[PDB]
Design a binder for this molecule. Structure first.
Ligand SMILES: [Cl-]
Ligand SMILES: [Cl-]
Length: 162
């Protein structure tokens, strides 16, 4: 297991524009297109992202391309963020995958806002951090996914994904 397989499990793969759990236009492996309600604004961002007139549909290769960019940007954002970098640096390899996952779903800004859980992870207080992480809109809104990430942070293993 690795970050790619983990996120592919959490986000799925759709080749047609769809709406995410928050109702925003998305495509591929959880690639958010836009927060606007306009399917047209969404189709525009899509074409812009792919470099072609897509008519709302992409191939698998294209999706995976967006995916690779997305993961890379997730990691780069973490290393560029003063609040997140130190946590990341402190973690072991599996746990790092869990922080990336959060950043990918909720953005650097959202994650950075989990101040207390971040401090706990940095201190390696696994069970405490797990409890704190769960007291969040994130967990209430996408509980199955949140549990998997949380368990990953708690155990430092990939069990939740096996
Ligand atoms: Cl893009
Ligand atoms: Cl879920």
């Amino acid at each position: 297991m690795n970050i790619f397989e983990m996120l592919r499990i959490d986000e799925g793969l759709r080749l047609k524009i769809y709406k995410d759990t928050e109702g925003y236009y998305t495509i591929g492996i959880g690639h958010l297109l836009t927060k606007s309600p306009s399917l047209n604004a969404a189709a525009s961002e899509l074409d812009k992202a792919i470099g072609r007139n897509t008519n709302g549909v992409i191939t698998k290769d294209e999706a995976e391309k967006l995916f690779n960019q997305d993961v890379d940007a997730a990691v780069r954002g973490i290393l560029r963020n003063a609040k997140l970098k130190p946590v990341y640096d402190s973690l072991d390899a599996v746990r790092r995958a869990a922080l990336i996952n959060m950043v990918f779903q909720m953005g650097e800004t959202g994650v950075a806002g989990f101040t207390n859980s971040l401090r706990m992870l940095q201190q390696k207080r696994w069970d405490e951090a797990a409890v704190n992480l769960a007291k969040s809109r994130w967990y209430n809104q996408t509980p199955n996914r949140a549990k998997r990430v949380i368990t990953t942070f708690r155990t430092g293993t990939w069990d939740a994904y096996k």
